[PDB]
Design a protein around this ligand. Structure first.
Ligand code: HEM
Length: 110
């Protein structure tokens, strides 16, 4: 099993390093990046992100649903294009398969 939890941790490190303002939309707003792994809100959110990646690989991802929910947080195409870059770095850092197609599916509904 690819260590998707580790990939997602690296993903959020890249994401909030590049776009620290994105963190303000989450229950772990203002938490130092080096302490995220000890934050209960983050632990829940990272778990869901892992779940989505496993659902994509598994054939069950609902990209329309995920898209609609992100629009509900005023998160759109710009942000997801940024996330694509970050996720590609995280995957590559772990010798994991690239997830660009999953992000493209979400982007198709944004
Ligand atoms: C690699 C791209 C991303 C994936 C796979 C992803 C995945 C997810 C998942 C699975 C959820 C939970 C949805 C649910 O419970 O139904 C979520 C929620 C959320 N996402 Fe993302 N996301 C991505 C990018 C982003 C970006 C770039 C932002 C920018 C701020 C963002 C902001 C949020 C926020 C604010 C929530 C709600 C959190 C809460 O309930 O407190 N996401 N995301």
């Amino acid at each position: 099993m690819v260590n998707w939890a580790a990939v997602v941790d690296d993903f959020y490190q890249e994401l909030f390093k590049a776009h620290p303002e994105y963190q303000n939309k989450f229950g772990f707003k203002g938490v130092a990046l080096g302490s995220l792994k000890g934050n209960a809100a983050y632990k829940t959110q990272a778990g869901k992100t892992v779940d989505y990646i496993n659902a994509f690989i598994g054939g069950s991802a609902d990209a329309a649903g995920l898209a609609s929910r992100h629009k509900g947080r005023n998160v759109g195409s710009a942000e997801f294009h940024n996330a694509k870059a970050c996720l590609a770095k995280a995957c590559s850092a772990h010798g994991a398969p690239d997830l660009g197609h999953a992000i493209d599916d979400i982007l198709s509904h944004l």
